[PDB]
Write a protein that binds this ligand. Structure first.
Ligand code: 8LV
Length: 1718
C-alpha cells in the first residue's frame, strides 16, 4: 500500500504537558477579576455539594466486606466518591476509570481494588495465599512511589503482604519481585521490565494494574503509559488470562477517550466527579504578573505571598511551594523579616505564645540547619537536601499544628500526605534539565500541590493561590477548572516505542505496527479530533480507521529506525528485522539517535578519555548547553576531575563530561542549574554505560569491555579505580580508608596480613581487626582450569570456581554475579564469555563451568580466563591457560565423497520377495544407499556407514540382513542400539518386514537372562541394547549361539562417545575378539552419525578403506536448513519464557503449512508450550490454522484420551508428548500427527529417541535441564540434539528439512561447530575399566597383566590414545608413552579390583577371580557395589537393613534429581514406614530408598518418580540375589531368608507384614476383612462365596482366574540318602524333589514389576538356632527337578535341621520341613 514520509516535527505537540487544545476558559459560578496594576487577581469560589442521588450513602467501614475492614482502621466512614465506587471496585472485575478532583482520596479506591484481588486468595485455612497473585501500582513520581510503598505497606500489613519499590537492577529486581505482592513503580520502569521479552517471568502472576495519575498521558512521558497499556491489552488477548486495569485521573477533557483506551465500559466502570465532589470545598485565587522587569516582579511576588499569609494569622496554617530548595529558606526568611513591618506582625502567627506548642517548637532546638532559626517563630522549610530526622521533625510539627507557616518544595507534595488549610504556589517556573531551560511547571505538579489544600477532618473549606505570570493565567485556569484537554504525545516517542515492540516480537512488520498503533491513545484521539492531529475531515470520512495515517506514521518511524540501524526495514514488503543495536536500545531504554552515535564512535582501541566523550554525546543530553553564569564553576570542576577533558572547550559535550566525572568524584556543587544537570546526566548514566558495555561485550572487544564495565561500577559506587576498594563498604569510617589510600601500596597485599600486621601497616593499630574483617568480606574467587583438546580447532575447558571469602547477607545479599571472559594472548579479544551466578545457599561449594574455545594451529603460548564481578570495583581474578605443553589431536581425514550414481532401483535387489518390502514405498534408493549398496549387499566384509540422522542408514543394515538371509536361511543376526526406545522401534519395523512378510524370526532381548538365551536360540534377527548383550556375551566361551552369529550390526556407534558408551565399546571389541578366536568370521556392520575420525572406528572394527563410508553432514539426502538462535538470558525459566514467541514465529516463517515438532526440556513445558502455540494462534485471529481436519472428525479418537488438556489442545491442532501419557495416548497423538490432521506436536526431550514421527521443521526449545545433584542447569548431550535435528526429514514430501535451535547465547558457538561439521568421538572406557576387567578375569580371558594389556588393544580407547593424548592425559603419542600409560591403567585397575576382594594377585603378574568378583560378573553388578554389600552385611541384617543397603548401590548413583524434587521427596519421606536419619534429599540413594518404600506400599507418584521407580525395580532383583549369595557365603541363615522375602515382596509390590492376598489383581486395602485369609486355602477352588464376600468385578474374575492358573502350586518330598550310615566329619546328602500339578504356561505374573520375570527357588538347609546356613541351591521348576544338597556332619550325632523352600517371586509359597540327622 502507498506510504508517505511524514514530517513528524509538524505533527507533534511541542509544548508537551503545557499544550492546550483548549480554546476559551469559562470560569465557574460567580468569579471575578481585580486589577492591582502590578498584577491581575482572578477569584474562583468553592462549588456547592450536588444533592445525593437515589440510594446513595456515605458508607462506614463496618458495611464494606468483612475481610476488607482491616487496612481501613482509622477510618470510620468512607468518603463520598469512595462510597460511590466501593461496589464497582470491590464486587466486580470490571476495568475502572476514575476521574476525581485533586484531593479526592483515590488511594482508598485503588486500595479497594487491591483488596478485591487479595480477597480471592483469602485461603480461610491460614492467613492469605501470597504466591497466587501480584499487583502492580504505577505512579509517575519516585517520591510518590516511596510514599505509596510506605502507605500500602502499613495498611496492608495485616494481610501478611509484601509491598515494595522496584529499584533499578538486573538481578535484585528478579528475586525481589518474586517475594513481592504489590510492586509500586514508575511507568518507564515497568516499561523496562515488560520490554525484556522474558517479561512474563515478572508479569505472569499479575492480576491487577493500577495507573495512578493517568492524565500523565498528556505529558511528554505519556507515550510510556500508552506503550504499557497497549502491550498489556494485547498480552491479555494472547494469554487469554485476564488482568484488571484501573485508571485514576484528574478531572479533565477527553476522559471518555481515556476510558476507551483502557477498555472500561462507560456504563459500568467510568466514574467522573467534577470539582464539587471534592471532600474539602476549595476556594481558588489566581495571581498573575503584568510586566517583564527583573526584581520588581519577584518583589511583587513576595508581597503577594505576605499579604496572603497575613489573612491567616493564628487562624490557619499556610503551605508555600517554591521551586528551589534554597528558595525555601530564602522565602521563609524573607516573609518573617517582612513580618517586622511598622508595628510588628512578626509573631502574630503564634500569639498562643503562652507557650502552648510554642515551647514544643522551642524544645525542638536540638536540631540543625535553617530550621533552628525559623522554628521558634512557627516558620519552617521542607526539601530533599535536608535529612530524614529534620524532615520528619518538620512534618510532625506541621501535623501537630505547631508550625504555622511552612515553605517547601514539590517533593513534599508528592512524598507525604500533609494537607494545610492554605496553599500558595510561587511563580510556576521550574528548571528542566532535559529541556535544558526554565519552563512552565508540570500540570501534574500543580494538581498534586493544590491537591494539598484543605484538611479532610479539620477544615470546612480549603484555599489555594497560584502566583504566575499574567499571560499563562488561562492555562492554569483551564487545568484546575476541568478545561485542559488530555492529548496524546505518542507522535513524539513513536520510533523508540515501535522499536521496543519490534524487539519483543509483537510487531514483525509494518501491518503489525498499524494494528499496534490501533491500541494507542493516539488512535482514539486522532479519530475524535482529526484536525488537531493534522487530518482532513475528507480523509477521515473516506478512511474512518485511519489506515493511511497509521501506515504513514509507521513508515516514517521505520525509516528512522532503519537509518540508525536498530532495525532492517524494506519498503516493499514492510517486514522488520531486529538488530543487536536495536535489542540493546530497547532493553536499556536508550533513544535511537544515541545508538547511532555509539555505533559510529565506538571502537576496540577507544581510550577512556574518548569513552567519556562518547557518553557525553548521548542524545538524551542534546538540549543541555553551557550557560555563561555556570562557566566558571565548570572550570573549577574540570580542575579536580581526573580524566583529561580533551580540548573541547565548554561546549555541552565537555560540560556533561565534567559533570559526570564530578559526580564520580563526589565533588560538591553550588549552581542550581549545574546541579540539576548533574543529577540528570548521572541518573541516566548507569543505563547508558550498561548499554555501551553490552554492545562491546557482544562484539568481543576485551579492552573496551574492561573499561566500560569499570565505568559502570564506578558510576554505581561513586569512586574511581584509583581509590580503595574498601570504600565500597559504607560502614567503614572514611578517614580510615583515606588513611589506607595515602599509604600507597597494592590493595592485594592486604589479603595476606594478620590483623596485627594490617593495623601496623596502616598506622592505625586499633582498626586492624575490622579492616581484616572487611578485606575478607570482599568477594574473591579462585580459578582452576582443565584442558581437553577436542579438535585442532577446538579445546574443551572445565573451569573450577572456588569461592574464597566470607559471605554476609548484609553485604552480599542472596547472590553475586560474575563474568567469565576467555581472551586471547594479547588480551585484545574475548573469545568466549558467559554470566556466572554464585547463589548464597551454594556458596563454599565449588562450581564447575564447562565451555569450548576456538584455537588456531599457529598456536599462541596461552589464553587468559578472567572472572570479573558484575558489581564490585577492583574485584577480579585472572587465570592464565598455557598452550605450551599441549599436543593438538591428529588431523582428521576428508569425508567420503558422495558420488552421483544413478539412483539405483529396488530391482537391483534381485529377490522379488525382498523387493516387495520396498517397491510400495519408493522406486529408488537414495544416494547414500546406492553408493554403499554393492559393498553391504554383495560383499561379506566389514563395513562402516557414517551419515547424518535421517539419511536412511537403517536399510543399509537391512541390505546386510537380506544378504545374510540369502547366504543361510537359518542364519543369526544380532543388532545393537544404545537406546531401548530405538530397539523397540526397530523391533516393530523389522518384525513386520522380516517375521510377517519374509517369515523369519525377529526377537527383542529382555531384562531376564534365561529367556534371552532362549530368544538368541530361536532368533534370525535379535534386537538388543548393549548391557543385555553384555550380560549375554560375557560367557561366550560357554555359549555357542553367541559364538555363531553371521551378522553383527551396531547402530549409532557415535554414542560410544557418550554416557554408557563404554559398554558399547566393550561388546563391540569382544565381538571382534571372538571373530578372530574362531573359524567362521563374524561380519560387522556399523552405522554412525558423521564422524570426524571414521578411520579409527573402521580400523577398530575391521573395515577396509573401501568399505568405509563417512559422509559429511551436508550431503544429507534431504538438505537441512539449520538456524541457531541465541538468547542472552542466564536464568533458565526466564530464557524459556522469552522463547515462547520465537517458537510461534519459527513455525509461521519456516513451516507455515507443513508439520512441526517442537522439543522442550520437560513434561510441564510440553503442555505450557502447546497452550501458548494455541492462544497465540487464536490471537492472530487464525485459530485451528494448525487443525487440518474437522474438529468433529477427531471426537471418536479423543474419547480414548485420559488427559483433558491434551483433548483441548488436539481440538486446536496441537498435540503433545510427555512421559506422563500412556503408550496408547502417545501412539494416538503420533498417528494423528502423521495423518496430517494435526500440524504441531510438542515433545519432552526424554521422548526424542522414542518417537516414530517426522516433521518439516524441528524446533529445539532451549538446550539445558536441571541437575539437582550439582544444583545447576546442564547441557543436552550432543547426541540428543543430533537425533532431534534428525527428526526433520521427509524425503517423500519435502524438498528440504528445516531446524531452528534456540539456545543460550553462550552455547551458540558450540552448536555451530558440532552440528555443521562431523562429530569427533573419544572413549570413556578408561574410567569404566573395573567391571569389564573383572568379568574377563572371571571367564579367564585375562589370566595375567599381559593378558590385560592385550585385551586393551582390541578397544577404541587404544586407537584414540595416540590420536589425542592430552584428552586421555598422555604426555606423548610415542609407543613408549602408550605402553607406560596402558600399564598404569592396567595396574591401578587390577589393584582396585584386588582391594575390593574381587580378584587375587600372585607374584604381581598372575590374576585370579575371587568369590565377590564372580558374583559381580554373574549378576552384572559394579564391583564397588558388592564390595559395599560385603562390608555392610552381617548375621544380624534384616529387611529394613537390606533395603537401606541395596538403595546404596552404585547402579543407583545415576538416578537424577530434578527441579524441586527435594520437597516432594521430603513429603514422600514423611509418608513411608521407615524414617530415614537426617536424609539429604538431593541424594539419589536416599531417593531410591524412599521410592523403594513407596513401591512396597503401592503409593502412586509423579510421572518422573514413576519412571525412576521403574528403573530402580529393574536392577533391584539382581542386587537382592547378590545379597543372598554374599550372605550365604558367610553362612548366615536369617538375613539370607530375609533377602529372599524382600525379593518376593519387591516383585509382588507388597510389604513384609500384611495380607498375602494382596497379590491377586484389583484387591485393595479395606475391600474385604472377610473371614478374620490365605490365597492357597482361599482357593480350594470352590465356587462359593465369591458372590457373598467380595466386591464383584466381571473383568477381575478373568484376571484373578488367570492369576491362579499361573500362581505357583508346589509340594515337596525329600529323603536324606543312606540315613544313619553317615557319621561325623562325613558327607550328608539331602535329596529333594520337585514334581508338579497344573504345569507351566507363561512368565511370572507381576503387574507392578516392570520386567517379565521367571519363577525361581531356593532350597536351603539350616540350623535355626545357631543361625548357620548349612547349604543352599537355586533353581527353576518347570516340570520336574532333582535337587542334591551336600554338607559336612559334626560330632556327637544327635542334630536337628530345617529345610526351607523359598521363591524369588511370590509370597505364601514358602515351605519348611524340620528333620534330624545321624
Ligand atoms: N521527574 C521524575 C521522574 C522522571 C523519570 C523519567 C524517566 C524515569 C525513569 C526512567 C527509567 C527508570 C526509572 C525507574 O523508576 O527505575 C525511571 O523517571 C521520576 O521517575 N520520579 C520523580 N521525578 N520527579 C521527582 C519529584 C521530586 C521533587 C520535584 C518534583 C519531582 S520524583
Amino acid at each position: 500500500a502507498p506510504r508517505q514520509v511524514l514530517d513528524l516535527e509538524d505533527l507533534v505537540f511541542t509544548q508537551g504537558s503545557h499544550f492546550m487544545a483548549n480554546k476559551r476558559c469559562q470560569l465557574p459560578d460567580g468569579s471575578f477579576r481585580r486589577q492591582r496594576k502590578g498584577y491581575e487577581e482572578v477569584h474562583v469560589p468553592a462549588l456547592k455539594p450536588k444533592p445525593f442521588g437515589s440510594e446513595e450513602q456515605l458508607l462506614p467501614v463496618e458495611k464494606l466486606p468483612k475481610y476488607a475492614q482491616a487496612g481501613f482502621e482509622g477510618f470510620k466512614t468512607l468518603n463520598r466518591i469512595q462510597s460511590k465506587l466501593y461496589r464497582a471496585a470491590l464486587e466486580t472485575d470490571e476495568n475502572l476509570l476514575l476521574c476525581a478532583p485533586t484531593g479526592a482520596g483515590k488511594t482508598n479506591v485503588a486500595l479497594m481494588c487491591m483488596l478485591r484481588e487479595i480477597g480471592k486468595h483469602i485461603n480461610m485455612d491460614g492467613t492469605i495465599n501470597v504466591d497466587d497473585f501480584k499487583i502492580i501500582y504505577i505512579a509517575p513520581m519516585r517520591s510518590l512511589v516511596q510514599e505509596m510503598v510506605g502507605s500500602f505497606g502499613k495498611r496492608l500489613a495485616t494481610y501478611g503482604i509484601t509491598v515494595a519499590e522496584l529499584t533499578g537492577d538486573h538481578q535484585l529486581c528478579k528475586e525481589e519481585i518474586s517475594a513481592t505482592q504489590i510492586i509500586v513503580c514508575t511507568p518507564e520502569k515497568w516499561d523496562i521490565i515488560t520490554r525484556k521479552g522474558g517479561e512474563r517471568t515478572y508479569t505472569q502472576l499479575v492480576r491487577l494494574i493500577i495507573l495512578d495519575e493517568i492524565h500523565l498521558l498528556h505529558d511528554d512521558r505519556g507515550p510510556v503509559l500508552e506503550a504499557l497499556v497497549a502491550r498489556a491489552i494485547r498480552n491479555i488477548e494472547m494469554t487469554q488470562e485476564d488482568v484488571r486495569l484501573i485508571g485514576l485521573s484528574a478531572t479533565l477533557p477527553n476522559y471518555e477517550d481515556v476510558a476507551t483506551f483502557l477498555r472500561v465500559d462507560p456504563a459500568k466502570g467510568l466514574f467522573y466527579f467534577d470539582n464539587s465532589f471534592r471532600p474539602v470545598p476549595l476556594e481558588q485565587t489566581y495571581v498573575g504578573i503584568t510586566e517583564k522587569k527583573a526584581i520588581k516582579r519577584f518583589q511583587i511576588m513576595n508581597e503577594i505571598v505576605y499579604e496572603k499569609i497575613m489573612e491567616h494569622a493564628g487562624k490557619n496554617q499556610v503551605l508555600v511551594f517554591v521551586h528551589s530548595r534554597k528558595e525555601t529558606g530564602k522565602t521563609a526568611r524573607a516573609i518573617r523579616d517582612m513580618c517586622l513591618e511598622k508595628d510588628t506582625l512578626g509573631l502574630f502567627l503564634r500569639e498562643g505564645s503562652a507557650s502552648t506548642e510554642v515551647l514544643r517548637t522551642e524544645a525542638e532546638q536540638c536540631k540543625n540547619l535553617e530550621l533552628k532559626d525559623l522554628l521558634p517563630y512557627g516558620f519552617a522549610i521542607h526539601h530533599a537536601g535536608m535529612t530524614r530526622v529534620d524532615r520528619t521533625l518538620v512534618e510532625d510539627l506541621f501535623a501537630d499544628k505547631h508550625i504555622q507557616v511552612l515553605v517547601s518544595t514539590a517533593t513534599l507534595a508528592w512524598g507525604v500526605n500533609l494537607p494545610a488549610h492554605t496553599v500558595i504556589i510561587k511563580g510556576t517556573q521550574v528548571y528542566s534539565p532535559e529541556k535544558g531551560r526554565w519552563t512552565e511547571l508540570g500540570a501534574l505538579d500543580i494538581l498534586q500541590m493544590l491537591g494539598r489544600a484543605g484538611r479532610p477532618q479539620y477544615d470546612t473549606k480549603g484555599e489555594g493561590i497560584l502566583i504566575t505570570s499574567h499571560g499563562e493565567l488561562q492555562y492554569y485556569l483551564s487545568l484546575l477548572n476541568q478545561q485542559l484537554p488530555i492529548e496524546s504525545q505518542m507522535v513524539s516517542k513513536l520510533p523508540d516505542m515501535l522499536n521496543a515492540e519490534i524487539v519483543l516480537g509483537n510487531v514483525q512488520n509494518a501491518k503489525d505496527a498499524v494494528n499496534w498503533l490501533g491500541y494507542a491513545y493516539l488512535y482514539i484521539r486522532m479519530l475524535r479530533s482529526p484536525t488537531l492531529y493534522g487530518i482532513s475531515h475528507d480523509d477521515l470520512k473516506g478512511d474512518p480507521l485511519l489506515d493511511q495515517r497509521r501506515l504513514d506514521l509507521v513508515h516514517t518511524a521505520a525509516l528512522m529506525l532503519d537509518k540508525n540501524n536498530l532495525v532492517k526495514y524494506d519498503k516493499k514488503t514492510g517486514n522488520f528485522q531486529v538488530t543487536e543495536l536495536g535489542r540493546i536500545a530497547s532493553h536499556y531504554y536508550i533513544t535511537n539517535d544515541t545508538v547511532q552515535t555509539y555505533n559510529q564512535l565506538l571502537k576496540p582501541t577507544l581510550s577512556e578519555i574518548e569513552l567519556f566523550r562518547v557518553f557525553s554525546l548521548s542524545s538524551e543530553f542534546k538540549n543541555i548547553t553551557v550557560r555563561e553564569e555556570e562557566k566558571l564553576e565548570l572550570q573549577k570542576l574540570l580542575e579536580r576531575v581526573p580524566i583529561p577533558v580533551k580540548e573541547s572547550i565548554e561546549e555541552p559535550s565537555a560540560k556533561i563530561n565534567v559533570l559526570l566525572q564530578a559526580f564520580i568524584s563526589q565533588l560538591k556543587l553550588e549552581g542550581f542549574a549545574l546541579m540539576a544537570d548533574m543529577v540528570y546526566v548521572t541518573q541516566s548514566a548507569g543505563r547508558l554505560m550498561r548499554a555501551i558495555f553490552e554492545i562491546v561485550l557482544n562484539r568481543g572487544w576485551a579492552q573496551l569491555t574492561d573499561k566500560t564495565l569499570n565505568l559502570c561500577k564506578m558510576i554505581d559506587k561513586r569512586m574511581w579505580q584509583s581509590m580503595c576498594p574498601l570504600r565500597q563498604f559504607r560502614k567503614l569510617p572514611e578517614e580510615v580508608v583515606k588513611k589506607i589510600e595515602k599509604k600507597n601500596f597494592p590493595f592485594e597485599r592486604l589479603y595476606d596480613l594478620n590483623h596485627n600486621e594490617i593495623g601496623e601497616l596502616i598506622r592505625m593499630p586499633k582498626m586492624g581487626k575490622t579492616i581484616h574483617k572487611y578485606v575478607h568480606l570482599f568477594p574473591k574467587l579462585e580459578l582452576s582450569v582443565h584442558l581437553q583438546p577436542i579438535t585442532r580447532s577446538t579445546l574443551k575447558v572445565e573451569l573450577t570456581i572456588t569461592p574464597d571469602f566470607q559471605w554476609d547477607e548484609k553485604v552480599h545479599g542472596s547472590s553475586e554475579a560474575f563474568w567469565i571472559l576467555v581472551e586471547d594472548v594479547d588480551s585484545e579479544v574475548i573469545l568466549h564469555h558467559e554470566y556466572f551466578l554464585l547463589k548464597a545457599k551454594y556458596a563454599q561449594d565449588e562450581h564447575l563451568i564447562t565451555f569450548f574455545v576456538p584455537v588456531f594451529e599457529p598456536l599462541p603460548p596461552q589464553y587468559f580466563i578472567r572472572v570479573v564481578s558484575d558489581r564490585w570495583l577492583s574485584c577480579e581474578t585472572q587465570l592464565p591457560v598455557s598452550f605450551r605443553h599441549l599436543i593438538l589431536p591428529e588431523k582428521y581425514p576428508p569425508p567420503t565423497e558422495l558420488l552421483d550414481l544413478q539412483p539405483l532401483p529396488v530391482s537391483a535387489l534381485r529377490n522379488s520377495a525382498f523387493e516387495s518390502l520396498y517397491q510400495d514405498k519408493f522406486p529408488f534408493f537414495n544416494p547414500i544407499q546406492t553408493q554403499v549398496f554393492n559393498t553391504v549387499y554383495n560383499s561379506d566384509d566389514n563395513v562402516f556407514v557414517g551419515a547424518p540422522t535421517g539419511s536412511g542408514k537403517t536399510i543399509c543394515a537391512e541390505f546386510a540382513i537380506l544378504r545374510m538371509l540369502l547366504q543361510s536361511s537359518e542364519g543369526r543376526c544380532v543388532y545393537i542400539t544404545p537406546m531401548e526406545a530405538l530397539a523397540e522401534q526397530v523391533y516393530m519395523d523389522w518384525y513386520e518386514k522380516f517375521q510377517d512378510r519374509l517369515n523369519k524370526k525377529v526377537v527383542l532381548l529382555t531384562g531376564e537372562t534365561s529367556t534371552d538365551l532362549k530368544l538368541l536360540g530361536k532368533g534370525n534377527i535379535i534386537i538388543s541394547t548393549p548391557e543385555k548383550w553384555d550380560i549375554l556375551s560375557r560367557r561366550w566361551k560357554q555359549r555357542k549361539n553367541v559364538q555363531n552369529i553371521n551378522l553383527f550390526v551396531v547402530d549409532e556407534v557415535h554414542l560410544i562417545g557418550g554416557e554408557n558408551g563404554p559398554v558399547l565399546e566393550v561388546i563391540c571389541s569382544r565381538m571382534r575378539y571372538i571373530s578372530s578366536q574362531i573359524e567362521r568370521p563374524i561380519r560387522i556392520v556399523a552405522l554412525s552419525s558423521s564422524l570426524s575420525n571414521a578411520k579409527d572406528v573402521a580400523h577398530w572394527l575391521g573395515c577396509s578403506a573401501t568399505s568405509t563410508f563417512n559422509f559429511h553432514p551436508n550431503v544429507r539426502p534431504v538438505p537441512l536448513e539449520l538456524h541457531i538462535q541465541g538468547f542472552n538470558i542466564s536464568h533458565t525459566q526466564t530464557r524459556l519464557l522469552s522463547m515462547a514467541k520465537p517458537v510461534y514465529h519459527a513455525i509461521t516463517k519456516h513451516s507455515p503449512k507443513k508439520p512441526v515438532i517442537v522439543f522442550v526440556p520437560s513434561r510441564k513445558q510440553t503442555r505450557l508450550t502447546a497452550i501458548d502455540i494455541l492462544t497465540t494462534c487464536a490471537a492472530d485471529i487464525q485459530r485451528q490454522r494448525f487443525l487440518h481436519c474437522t474438529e468433529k472428525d477427531l471426537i471418536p479418537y479423543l474419547e480414548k484420551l485420559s488427559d483433558s488438556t491434551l483433548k483441548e489442545t488436539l481440538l486446536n491442532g496441537v498435540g503433545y508428548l510427555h512421559e506422563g501419557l500412556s503408550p496408547m495416548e502417545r501412539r494416538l497423538v503420533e498417528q494423528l500427527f502423521s495423518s496430517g490432521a494435526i500440524q504441531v506436536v510438542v515433545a519432552s526431550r526424554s521422548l526424542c529417541w522414542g518417537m516414530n514421527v517426522a516433521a518439516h521443521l524441528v524446533i529445539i526449545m532451549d538446550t539445558q535441564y536441571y541437575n539437582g545433584k550439582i544444583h545447576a542447569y546442564v547441557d543436552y548431550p550432543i547426541y540428543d540434539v543430533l537425533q532431534m535435528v534428525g527428526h526433520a526429514n521427509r524425503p517423500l514430501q519435502d524438498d528440504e528439512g528445516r531446524c531452528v535451535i534456540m539456545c543460550q547465547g553462550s552455547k551458540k558457538d558450540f552448536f555451530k561447530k558440532f552440528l555443521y561439521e562431523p562429530l569427533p568421538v573419544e572413549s570413556h572406557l578408561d574410567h569404566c575399566m573395573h567391571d569389564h576387567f573383572n568379568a574377563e578375569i572371571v571367564t579367564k580371558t585375562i589370566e595375567n597383566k599381559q593378558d590385560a594389556v592385550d585385551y586393551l588393544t582390541w578397544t577404541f580407547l587404544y586407537r584414540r590414545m595416540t590420536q589425542n593424548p592430552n584428552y586421555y592425559n598422555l604426555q606423548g603419542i610415542s609407543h613408549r608413552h602408550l605402553s607406560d600409560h596402558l600399564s598404569e591403567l592396567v595396574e591401578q585397575t587390577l589393584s582396585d579390583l584386588e582391594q575390593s576382594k574381587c580378584i587375587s594377585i600372585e607374584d604381581e603378574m598372575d590374576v585370579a577371580p575371587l568369590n565377590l568378583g564372580m558374583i559381580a560378573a554373574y549378576y552384572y553388578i559394579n564391583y564397588t557395589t558388592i564390595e559395599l554389600f560385603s562390608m555392610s552385611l552381617n548375621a544380624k541384617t534384616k529387611v529394613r537393613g537390606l533395603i537401606e543397603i541395596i538403595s546404596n548401590a552404585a547402579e543407583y548413583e545415576n538416578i537424577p534429581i530434578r527441579h524441586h524434587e527435594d520437597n516432594l521427596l521430603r513429603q514422600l519421606a514423611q509418608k513411608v514406614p521407615h524414617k530415614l536419619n537426617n536424609p539429604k534429599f538431593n541424594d539419589p540413594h536416599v531417593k531410591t530408598n524412599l521410592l523403594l518404600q513407596a513401591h512396597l506400599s503401592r503409593m502412586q507418584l509423579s510421572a518422573e518418580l514413576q519412571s525412576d521407580t521403574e528403573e530402580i525395580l529393574s536392577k533391584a532383583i539382581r542386587l537382592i540375589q547378590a545379597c543372598v549369595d554374599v550372605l550365604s557365603s558367610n553362612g548366615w541363615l536369617s538375613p539370607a531368608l530375609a533377602a529372599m522375602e524382600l525379593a518376593q515382596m519387591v516383585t509382588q509390590a507388597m510389604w513384609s507384614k500384611d495380607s498375602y492376598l494382596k497379590q491377586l489383581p484389583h484387591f485393595t486395602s479395606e475391600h474385604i476383612k472377610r473371614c478374620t485369609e490365605s490365597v492357597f486355602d482361599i482357593m480350594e477352588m470352590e465356587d462359593e462365596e465369591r458372590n457373598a464376600l467380595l466386591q464383584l468385578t466381571d473383568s477381575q474374575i478373568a484376571d484373578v482366574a488367570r492369576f491362579c492358573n499361573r500362581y505357583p502350586n508346589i509340594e515337596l518330598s525329600y529323603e536324606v540318602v543312606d540315613k544313619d550310615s553317615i557319621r561325623s566329619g562325613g558327607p550328608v546328602v539331602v535329596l529333594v524333589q520337585l514334581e508338579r500339578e497344573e504345569e507351566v504356561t507363561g512368565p511370572v505374573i507381576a503387574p507392578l514389576f516392570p520386567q517379565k520375570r521367571e519363577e525361581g527357588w531356593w532350597v536351603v538347609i539350616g540350623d535355626a538356632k545357631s543361625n548357620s546356613l548349612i547349604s543352599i541351591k537355586r533353581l527353576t521348576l518347570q516340570q520336574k527337578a532333582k535337587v542334591k544338597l551336600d554338607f559336612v556332619a559334626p560330632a556327637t550325632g544327635a542334630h536337628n535341621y530345617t529345610l526351607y523352600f523359598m521363591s524369588d517371586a511370590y509370597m505364601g509359597c514358602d515351605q519348611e520341613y524340620k528333620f534330624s540327622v545321624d
